[PDB]
Design a protein around this ligand. Structure first.
Ligand SMILES: Nc1nc2c(ncn2[C@@H]2O[C@H](COP(=O)(O)OP(=O)(O)OP(=O)(O)O)[C@@H](O)[C@H]2O)c(=O)[nH]1
Ligand SMILES: Nc1ncnc2c1ncn2[C@@H]1O[C@H](COP(=O)(O)OP(=O)(O)CP(=O)(O)O)[C@@H](O)[C@H]1O
Ligand SMILES: Nc1nc2c(ncn2[C@@H]2O[C@H](COP(=O)(O)OP(=O)(O)O)[C@@H](O)[C@H]2O)c(=O)[nH]1
Ligand SMILES: CCNc1ccc(S(C)(=O)=O)cc1F
Ligand SMILES: CCNc1ccc(S(C)(=O)=O)cc1F
Ligand SMILES: [Ca+2]
Ligand SMILES: [Ca+2]
Ligand SMILES: [Ca+2]
Ligand SMILES: [Mg+2]
Ligand SMILES: [Mg+2]
Ligand SMILES: [Mg+2]
Lengths: 352, 54, 425, 438
């Protein structure tokens, strides 16, 4: 009889995993403070990793990789890509970004301006976007003066990166979108890409001459369903799944989602996760880790994939909770605590 | 990767490698503690004996 | 040289005490005349804990036999190992206690207590470093219950910083001698709450049910119940009587078993309990499952009705200490809902190589469970059922007691129940 | 030559002392009777090994050690054991009854009655020293003597020897080899009162030693002898500089200078490699790069924790055996480009390296195999704060219910000393976080 504890009551993903675990009749849920557990569905912040793997005779597993925040933090991700030789500052799939500390607090204020002035002088598109991890607070603008002034009005670290002025627009609608990929890394550091992804599309026509209205530039499900008037017109909940999006790419662009986009996404996932493997691997550790990641991508009119950010506690598409959650139990939990296909994941092999 | 202060003798050697430059209670006071706790033990044992005498 | 002075009082106390010394004397190689005839040095290692060495290499138990009538102690002196006890350590009267706590505690018992203390003092004066005391007695009679608790109170007065341990037989209506047993048990329980560091609670009903249902004894006798108690006593004292990878005296055990001074009443048990299918080998999983089974415990309390504050387990015999840790950690990590989560690592395991006579291996269970409140609740209900009508009180008021003293004993034990109830949640 | 006096307190300290002084003798060629044929200066001399051994006129080499325990059964093994002849009776101090795993009992009740005797016996050893460096104190955290009496001794040693360095070898409590439940109380109580008196302390977590014995030595159920012979190898690696000719960590003061830039953060993490089973047919001898790389495997650390998520303040590499500097620098370079070694910005990123050509000595019939080279890495990492967090959490679970507190109050301790000691640990954890986390 395996035991587990739940320490994040706000997780829709692991609430389902917890629901499935109990369904097997072979897992027992303990009080969130009981240390004699096999599996911890830990909290989002300040998970006490230092207390895992010290219970005699208990093999303990946690659904978070200690140190993965370096990848899932806006500021940390920029620093990781620029300072990691595996990714280098010349990384071709990540937009030009700079860490900008508000003046009321290293910092890349000058470096950003030097690149900005270069674009302004070279008649090139000089539109950037500012954001931070303390957001629901985003600002898109072409003037460097406005971008920086917005960060000083705040008190948290921000990042300014190039705004993809040439996004791939779906037709009909002439509308923007981003791709969400769920990735599961198990205790052995196998990288599993969930076969099912989701496009979070904008239900408004993309307009490049007015960044004041952020409803056609931001494809977040909360903004489209709250500030957009054409929500749910072209697809239910502004969510297009791979089957539809792949058929579109064939009829419209005479290509497939695998060839034009998925190869780059798999490459980007592998590059990011392999880079931080030595820092977060639990191979020779007194406890074992796994974690589900939400990768967010952008596609431009050239069918080039761009990495936007990595979420360390992602939610799932309503229609995909059952399949993915069961997949988490199969490869991440039962692989360590076996019970008494055609996998839904795509294994991105690599050298350890 | 510099090596400094290399010292060699017949039974071994030692050195230093630099990869990157940088960026009480007195005797009396202890006695009071020991006697203080001793007094609290006596008080507790006196209350027990008072309890048993009752 | 951490000596223990053993005291047995009253009928129950002396008959169970007799069997105890019979059992361990056999385990240590001491014959009925006090001569050693073992074949292992582990038998004499900690032998001085319970025995005195006399002239001619004789070993005499450090035991004091107390009673208010001569009958039971005449049986001991005529029993199997009766000759092994010190003749001077027999302290008895002639009046009896009439199953009356007031007689053992205030009248008949008070007349004899000083002479008992003279023997206790004489045994203590010959101890290199007295660990403490252990008393065997029942709570439902008059001598072991009333005079026993009086003895404990006077021992505490004279040896305030020594550990006082008891094996206390709790009465049951199913195995009862007189109707006043709830009165005598309630009066003693308050004494024990104040003046003992550890009390092993032995319920005569649990002993009966084990003999009848598990051991398949059609008609259990007091002797059959005493076989279980003497066996249990040998199991819990194995930590002290033999050498091993444990340096534990009575005070160290108390420090790790008693988180709160009044909650020091333990549920004991052991395995195997086999009926005569008695030559089969018992695997470690079997030993561990049974040891934690309520049917193998002698307090007649279902542990699944409360929570364990602390648990100690002693395994005897040559076995897989690795497999022991696995099965022990399997019982906890499979029933952690019955262990308080605010005492880390509150289940401890000890191993002793020397098994009991006639067994390849065994396991002794010592639990400090809040389910023991069920035992005190039973006694309280029986007490109140009579006391509300003041039934049979004249036997006690006639010895100088007043009704107020019963009312307070009742309140004291109901408080003890309420104390267990708050730590169970 | 400057003398070092070793003090072994409680069961853990005494038994670890047995393993260490056995190993010391085998390393220096001293026989159980105290004789040392290689020592050509009879009854005198100021050699490096004389920091730990004095000499009688008859040529006996006597450890500069005191064994103290409140109960005699553990020290009585020394009195009749193999090395009974090394020590004289005045060096072995035993009381009548122990502290019963009760800090208050060892610190106050029993400690008050024997502390003056212990100081007198230590004073005797000090009187034989022409330039005493200080003391090495071995003890457990969980034992009532190891915790309670040690803290009292450390207080008095600071008074009677105000200018002397004091180092600790402390055994951190692990449930797999302990039947006690109150050890978190004793650990926090003794760390609070000892903190301002210890210049440098090496914690060894029994959980770590237990797992190394099961994993590397294939011991299904390790014993105290198995654990202590492994611990004494680490202790020897740490103290070899004081007993052999050298230029790194030559006196006790150098340990604080090289490992403790901040006084309260004086708990270096020890890592040792290689540990090879003697029962093995014949292990392939590991290289300098391989044993050095092993110093960054959590599995060979004396305290299980993740240094990848801390910051280093200092780092010593202590090699014994066939090791030359060329091979150390080559291995270190390869580890910088592969590992996550984050130093604090106010500390240089570097290593102090010591090499002793005599490879590790192995007790005949022991569990450890003879190796041609071994290394012990001493690094002051904020990651070791995980051990304080673990221990502090167990303290909080019990203290919230006041479980077992009456045993301590009953020995004359005030309950306020509990919360006072806990608040000091809360500040110790805050100090670690201020240095390590951004
Ligand atoms: N590594 C190691 N740990 C030990 C040894 N002996 C005891 N311990 C540990 O020390 C703790 C128990 O404290 P002890 O040192 O035995 O007790 P003490 O210092 O003698 O104090 P008392 O309570 O008076 O007996 C437990 O955590 C044991 O695991 C030993 O020989 N080696
Ligand atoms: N450089 C860039 N170019 C174009 N669009 C961008 C962009 N950076 C962000 N966006 C837009 O912002 C949205 C994602 O914002 P971001 O992910 O940075 O904030 P967030 O983390 O609060 C949303 P989530 O974490 O749920 O994906 C995308 O829909 C994308 O269209
Ligand atoms: N287990 C056991 N219980 C006994 C024995 N003799 C009496 N009792 C129980 O003890 C209580 C009577 O006390 P008893 O010892 O006979 O009275 P005392 O001699 O005045 O102390 C009743 O609850 C009996 O069931 C015995 O030999 N074994
Ligand atoms: C005939 C059976 N006897 C017996 C059994 C078990 C034990 S025990 C509690 O395991 O010590 C002692 C015994 F004497
Ligand atoms: C030569 C004797 N060596 C030795 C003796 C005892 C111990 S003990 C059991 O751990 O106290 C360890 C030892 F290494
Ligand atoms: Ca009379
Ligand atoms: Ca000499
Ligand atoms: Ca000092
Ligand atoms: Mg985000
Ligand atoms: Mg009777
Ligand atoms: Mg001890």
């Amino acid at each position: 009889m395996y035991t587990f504890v739940v320490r994040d009551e706000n997780s829709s993903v692991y609430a389902e995993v917890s629901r499935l675990l109990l369904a097997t009749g072979q897992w027992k849920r303990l009080r969130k403070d009981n240390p004699r557990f096999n599996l911890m569905l830990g909290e989002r912040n300040r998970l006490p990793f230092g207390r895992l793997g010290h219970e005699p005779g208990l093999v303990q597993l946690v659904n978070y990789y200690r140190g993965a925040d370096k990848l899932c933090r806006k500021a940390s991700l920029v620093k990781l890509i620029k300072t990691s030789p595996e990714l280098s500052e010349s990384c071709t799939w990540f937009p030009e970004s700079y860490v900008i500390y508000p003046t009321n607090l290293t910092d890349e204020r000058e470096v950003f301006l030097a690149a900005y002035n270069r674009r302004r002088e070279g008649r090139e598109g000089n539109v950037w976007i500012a954001k931070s991890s303390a957001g629901a607070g985003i600002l898109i603008s072409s003037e460097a003066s406005e971008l920086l002034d917005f960060i000083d009005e705040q008190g948290q670290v921000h990042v300014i990166q190039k705004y993809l002025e040439k996004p791939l627009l779906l037709e009909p609608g002439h509308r923007k979108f981003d791709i969400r990929s769920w990735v599961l890394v198990d205790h052995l550091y196998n990288i599993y890409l969930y076969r099912e992804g989701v496009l979070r599309t904008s239900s408004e026509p993309y307009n490049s001459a007015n960044f004041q209205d952020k409803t056609c530039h931001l494809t977040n499900h909360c903004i489209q369903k709250e500030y957009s008037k054409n929500y749910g017109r072209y697809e239910e909940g502004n969510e297009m799944f791979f089957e539809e999006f792949n058929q579109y790419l064939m009829d419209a662009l005479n290509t497939t989602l695998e060839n034009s986009i998925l190869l780059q996404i798999k490459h980007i996932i592998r590059s990011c996760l392999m880079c931080i493997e030595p820092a977060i691997s639990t191979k020779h550790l007194h406890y074992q880790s796994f974690q589900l990641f939400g990768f967010d991508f952008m596609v431009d009119e050239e069918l080039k994939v761009w990495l936007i950010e990595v979420n360390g506690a992602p939610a799932c598409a309503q229609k995909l909770y059952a399949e993915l959650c069961q997949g988490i139990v199969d490869v991440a939990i039962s692989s360590v605590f076996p019970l008494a296909p055609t996998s839904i994941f795509i294994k991105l092999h690599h050298h350890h | 990767m510099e090596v400094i202060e290399l010292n060699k003798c017949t039974s071994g050697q030692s050195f230093e490698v630099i990869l990157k430059p940088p960026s009480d209670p007195s005797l009396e006071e202890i006695q009071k503690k020991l006697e203080a706790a001793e007094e609290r033990r006596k008080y507790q044992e006196a209350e027990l004996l008072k309890h048993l005498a009752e | 040289m951490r000596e223990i002075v053993h005291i047995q009082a009253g009928q129950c106390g002396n008959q169970i005490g007799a069997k105890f010394w019979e059992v361990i004397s056999d385990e240590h190689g001491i014959d009925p005349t006090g001569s050693y005839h073992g074949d292992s040095d582990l038998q004499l290692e900690r032998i001085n804990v319970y025995y005195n060495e006399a002239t001619g290499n004789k070993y005499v138990p450090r035991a004091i036999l107390v009673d208010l009538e001569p009958g039971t102690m005449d049986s001991v002196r005529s029993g199997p190992f009766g000759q092994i006890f010190r003749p001077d350590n027999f302290v008895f009267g002639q009046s009896g206690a009439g199953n009356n706590w007031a007689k053992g505690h205030y009248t008949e018992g008070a007349e004899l207590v000083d002479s008992v203390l003279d023997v206790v003092r004489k045994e203590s004066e010959s101890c290199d470093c007295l660990q403490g005391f252990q008393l065997t007695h029942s709570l439902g009679g008059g001598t072991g219950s009333g005079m026993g608790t009086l003895l404990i109170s006077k021992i505490r007065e004279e040896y305030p910083d020594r550990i006082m341990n008891t094996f206390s037989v709790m009465p049951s209506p199913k195995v009862s001698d007189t109707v006043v047993e709830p009165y005598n048990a309630t009066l003693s329980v308050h004494q024990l709450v104040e003046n003992t560091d550890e009390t092993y609670c032995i319920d005569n009903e649990a002993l009966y049910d084990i003999c009848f249902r598990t051991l398949k004894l059609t008609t259990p006798t007091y002797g059959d119940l005493n076989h279980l108690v003497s066996a249990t006593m040998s199991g819990v004292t194995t930590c002290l009587r033999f050498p091993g990878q444990l340096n534990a005296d009575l005070r160290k055990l108390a420090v790790n078993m008693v988180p709160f001074p009044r909650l020091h009443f333990f549920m004991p048990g052991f395995a195997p309990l086999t009926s005569r299918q008695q030559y089969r080998a018992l695997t470690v999983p079997e030993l561990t499952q049974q040891m934690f089974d309520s049917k193998n415990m002698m307090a007649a309390c279902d542990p699944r009705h409360g929570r364990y504050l602390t648990v100690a387990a002693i395994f005897r015999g040559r076995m897989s200490m690795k497999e022991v840790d696995e099965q022990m950690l399997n019982v906890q990590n499979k029933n952690s809902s019955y262990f308080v989560e605010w005492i880390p690592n509150n289940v401890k395991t000890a191993v002793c190589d020397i098994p009991p006579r006639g067994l390849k291996m065994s396991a002794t269970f010592i639990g400090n469970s809040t389910a023991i409140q069920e035992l005190f609740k039973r006694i309280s209900e029986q007490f109140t059922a009579m006391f509300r009508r003041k039934a049979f009180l004249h036997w006690y008021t006639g010895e100088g007691m007043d009704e107020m003293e019963f009312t307070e004993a009742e309140s004291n034990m109901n408080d003890l129940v309420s104390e267990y109830q708050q730590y169970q949640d | 030559m400057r003398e070092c006096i070793s003090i072994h307190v409680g069961q853990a300290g005494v038994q670890i002392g047995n393993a260490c002084w056995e190993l010391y003798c085998l390393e220096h060629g001293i026989q159980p009777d105290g004789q040392m044929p290689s020592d050509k200066t009879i009854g005198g001399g100021d050699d490096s090994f004389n920091t730990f051994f004095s000499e009688t006129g008859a040529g006996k080499h006597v450890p500069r050690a005191v064994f103290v325990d409140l109960e005699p059964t553990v020290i009585d093994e020394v009195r009749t054991g193999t090395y009974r002849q090394l020590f004289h009776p005045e060096q072995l101090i035993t009381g009548k009854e122990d502290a019963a795993n009760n800090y208050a009992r060892g610190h106050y009740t029993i400690g008050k009655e024997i502390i003056d005797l212990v100081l007198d016996r230590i004073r005797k050893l000090a009187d034989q020293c022409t330039g005493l460096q200080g003391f090495l104190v071995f003890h457990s955290f969980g034992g009532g003597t190891g915790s309670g009496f040690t803290s009292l001794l450390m207080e008095r040693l600071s008074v009677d020897y105000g200018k002397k360095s004091k180092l600790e070898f402390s055994i951190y409590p692990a449930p797999q080899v302990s039947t006690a439940v109150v050890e978190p109380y004793n650990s926090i109580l003794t760390t609070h009162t000892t903190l301002e008196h210890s210049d440098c302390a090496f914690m060894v977590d029994n959980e770590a030693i237990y797992d190394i014995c099961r994993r590397n030595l294939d011991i299904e159920r390790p014993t105290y002898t198995n654990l202590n012979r492994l611990i004494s190898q680490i202790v020897s690696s740490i103290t070899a500089s004081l007993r052999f000719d050298g230029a790194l960590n030559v006196d006790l003061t150098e340990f604080q200078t090289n490992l403790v830039p901040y006084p309260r953060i004086h708990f270096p993490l020890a890592t040792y490699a290689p540990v090879i089973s003697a029962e093995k047919a014949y292990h392939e001898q590991l290289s300098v790069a391989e044993i050095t790389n092993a110093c960054f495997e959590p599995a060979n650390q004396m305290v299980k924790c993740d240094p990848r998520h801390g910051k280093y303040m200092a780092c010593c590499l202590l090699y014994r055996g066939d090791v030359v500097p060329k091979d150390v620098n080559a291995a270190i370079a390869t580890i910088k480009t592969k590992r996550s070694i984050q130093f604090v910005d106010w500390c240089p990123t570097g290593f102090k390296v010591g090499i002793n050509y005599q490879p590790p000595t192995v007790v005949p019939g022991g569990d450890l195999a003879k190796v041609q080279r071994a290394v012990c890495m001493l690094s002051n990492t904020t990651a070791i704060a995980e051990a304080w967090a673990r221990l502090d959490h167990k303290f909080d679970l019990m203290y919230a219910k006041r479980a077992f507190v009456h045993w301590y109050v009953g020995e004359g301790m005030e309950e306020g000393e509990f919360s006072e000691a806990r608040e000091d640990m809360a500040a110790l954890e805050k100090d670690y976080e201020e240095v390590g986390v951004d």
